[PDB]
From a paper:
The large family of Gram-positive quorum-sensing receptors known as the RNPP proteins consists of receptors homologous to the Rap, NprR, PlcR, and PrgX proteins that are regulated by imported oligopeptide autoinducers. Rap proteins are phosphatases and transcriptional anti-activators, and NprR, PlcR, and PrgX proteins are DNA binding transcription factors. Rap proteins and their inhibitory oligopeptides, called Phr peptides, have been most extensively studied in B. subtilis, which encodes 11 Rap proteins on its chromosome and another five on plasmids. Sequence and structural analysis shows that the Rap proteins are repeat proteins consisting of nine HTH TPR or TPR-like folds, which pack together to form a right-handed superhelical TPR domain.
Residue numbers in the entry: 101 to 374
Write the structure that this text describes.
């Protein structure tokens, strides 16, 4: 009963996003976990802990607590959902460490389990995340095939991940210079983003637009970064500005390319500063 209180309190503080309090409460719940019964109430506990750690990008701690929950959840065949989610945490942490090959292995396992258990949304989530790793690994053909499979499911369900999947799909096709097919996913995603009031992807589509689908309207890229930066989305600013910087480097536009490397530096500094 005592562990339960500290446990619930941790989830409670995480809800109001008091991260220090949550982990603080979890730290004692874990001590009073000495008197724990079922292997899966522990697993439930470890999962939550890995999650708050994943939120604070404490990559080492998150992946530790995730694996401990995972190694238990795998057995109990009634807990496929929990198993898949644990694997997402592991793979998300691996993504944060730029271990995209290892993260792909995780997500591939997730897809198998999501399949043999017919969890439709987890199937699309695996496909999407697989496609994202592939994009990072620059295997764009496979990235696209996994992304449309995700798209088929999300379009039916109208889940929020629809926008992000269309965005990633658009970008992947643009990187292969498949500008005509990309423009189709661009208009479709840009529309879904606008009508869902997804201001974040609206700004992100504007970056693709300035990059690929206007006549070189670079101010669109700029204004979109202004929007993102104003929203304190510095990870997005850091990652996207590097992609933009790389692209201009490949074109031989060194001045523009430098401007965006500089911006990524600043965004990184803002992340360390909190
Ligand atoms: Cl094309």
């Amino acid at each position: 009963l005592e562990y339960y209180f500290y446990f619930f309190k941790g989830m409670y503080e995480f809800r109001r996003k008091e991260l220090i309090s949550a982990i603080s409460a979890y730290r004692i719940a874990e001590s009073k976990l000495s008197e724990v019964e079922d292997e899966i109430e522990k697993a439930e506990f470890f999962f939550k802990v890995s999650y708050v750690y994943y939120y604070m990008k404490q990559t080492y701690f998150s992946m530790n607590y995730a694996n401990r929950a995972l190694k238990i959840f795998r057995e109990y065949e009634e807990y496929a959902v929990q198993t898949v989610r644990c694997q997402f945490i592991v793979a998300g942490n691996l993504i944060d460490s730029l271990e995209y090959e290892r993260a792909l292995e995780q997500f591939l396992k997730s897809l198998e389990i999501s399949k043999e258990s017919n969890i439709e949304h987890l199937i699309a989530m695996s496909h999407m995340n697989i496609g994202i790793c592939y994009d990072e690994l620059k295997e764009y053909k496979k990235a696209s095939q996994h992304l449309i499979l995700a798209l088929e499911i999300f379009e039916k369900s109208k889940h929020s991940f629809l926008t992000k999947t269309l965005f990633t799909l658009t970008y992947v096709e643009a990187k292969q210079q498949n500008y005509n097919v990309a423009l189709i996913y661009f208009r479709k995603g840009r529309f879904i983003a606008d009508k869902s009031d997804d201001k974040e992807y609206s700004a992100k589509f504007k970056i693709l637009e300035g990059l690929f689908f206007s006549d070189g309207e670079t101010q669109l890229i700029k204004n979109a970064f202004s929007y993102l930066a104003s929203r304190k989305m510095f990870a997005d600013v850091e990652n996207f500005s590097i992609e933009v910087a790389d692209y201009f480097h490949e074109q031989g536009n060194l001045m523009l390319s430098n401007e965006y490397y500089r911006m990524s530096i600043e965004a990184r500094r803002k992340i360390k500063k909190g």
